[PDB]
Design a protein. Structure first.
Lengths: 168, 134
């Protein structure tokens, strides 16, 4: 069985942990619970092939930027998450992609832009903006809500499919 | 700064930030439960960086602050009936129903060990640990 090492990055409060726990345990809670380092393993069937996802959920803040450097080096694919009601988290995506490119010495890194909290009405980043960012980066964009589970499988499946394409 | 690095069953890990007065159990319950692991099925150990003994078991009620800066490991108790699933593809010629969504299942997947059967797009909702009392 192929294992896929995934890393979830993005600013604080955007729902990285909620997205991961929804995927892993089919469960959503409203509680904010600060992440330092958390890895999860879960079997998933993707396009008829069982694979093992090894998912690392990270802290967004600058304090742990040297930890993130090491996490990213061995990561094979990256979920770059922003909250669709937080424009700063959207623009901060750029810092996380720059950080990833530094430890990969490549622009060809499997990556999906994830716009989370799509259940909320207070939306400040619209679908068109994010598609344009993802287009300029050459990566897919997926809308999600960790609260409703909308698009959660789609984000992780799309990232696995990006890794598979890259390993061709 | 008041953190403990904790290796967890099935090659997982967490870094816990310790709130004074909490036990190891208080600090690790959520980490285990979110990974589909029952605390009652596990033991917690202090890793020993010395020979003739890799780890030493600790009481779950041990004060967590007292172990700050050490590396701990949580392992399954001996012979607990928990394993990882062994998924195989399966075409159901007879009418069958998904264990996740209860809809018709024609082409799906099935755990050869516990018999869980499901649609591909239902696989992430299959519980993480396979329960085998066979
Ligand atoms: N409405 C809504 N709330 C969400 C969604 N995803 C996460 N949240 C909420 O947003 C807050 C932060 O979620 P969390 O997953 O901890 O964010 P994080 O990206 O892990 N932050 P950190 O880097 O500090 O660990 C929580 O209150 C959580 O319930 C979503 O899709 N919709
Ligand atoms: Cl049906
Ligand atoms: Mg988090
Ligand atoms: Zn910035
Ligand atoms: Zn099973
Ligand atoms: Zn189903």
């Amino acid at each position: 069985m192929t294992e896929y090492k995934l890393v979830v990055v993005g600013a604080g409060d955007v729902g990285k942990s909620a997205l991961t726990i929804q995927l892993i345990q089919n469960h959503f809670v409203d509680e904010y619970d600060p992440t330092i380092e958390d890895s999860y393993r879960k079997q998933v069937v993707i396009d008829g092939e069982t694979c093992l996802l090894d998912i690392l959920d990270t802290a967004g803040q600058e304090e742990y930027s040297a930890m993130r450097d090491q996490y990213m080096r061995t990561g094979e694919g990256f979920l770059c998450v922003f909250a669709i009601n937080n424009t700063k988290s959207f623009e901060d995506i750029h810092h996380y992609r720059e950080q990833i490119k530094r430890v990969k010495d490549s622009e060809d890194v499997p990556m999906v832009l994830v716009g989370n909290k799509c259940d909320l009405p207070s939306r400040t980043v619209d679908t068109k903006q994010a598609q344009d960012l993802a287009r300029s980066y050459g990566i897919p964009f997926i809308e999600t809500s960790a609260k409703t589970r909308q698009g959660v499988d789609d984000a992780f499946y799309t990232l696995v499919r990006e890794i598979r394409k890259h390993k061709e | 700064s008041n953190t403990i690095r904790v290796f967890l069953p099935n090659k997982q890990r967490t870094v816990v930030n310790v709130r004074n007065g909490m036990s190891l159990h208080d600090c690790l319950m959520k980490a285990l439960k979110v990974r589909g692991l029952q605390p009652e099925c596990c033991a917690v150990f202090r890793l020993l960086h010395e020979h003739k003994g890799k780890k030493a078991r600790l009481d779950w009620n041990t004060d967590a602050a007292s172990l700050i800066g050490e590396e701990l490991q949580v392992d399954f108790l001996d012979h607990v009936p928990l394993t990882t699933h062994n998924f195989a593809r399966k075409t159901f010629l007879k009418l069958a129903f998904c264990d996740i969504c209860q809809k018709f299942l024609l082409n799906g997947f099935r755990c050869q060990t516990c018999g869980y059967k499901f649609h591909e797009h239902c696989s992430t909702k299959v519980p993480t640990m396979c329960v085998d009392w066979s």
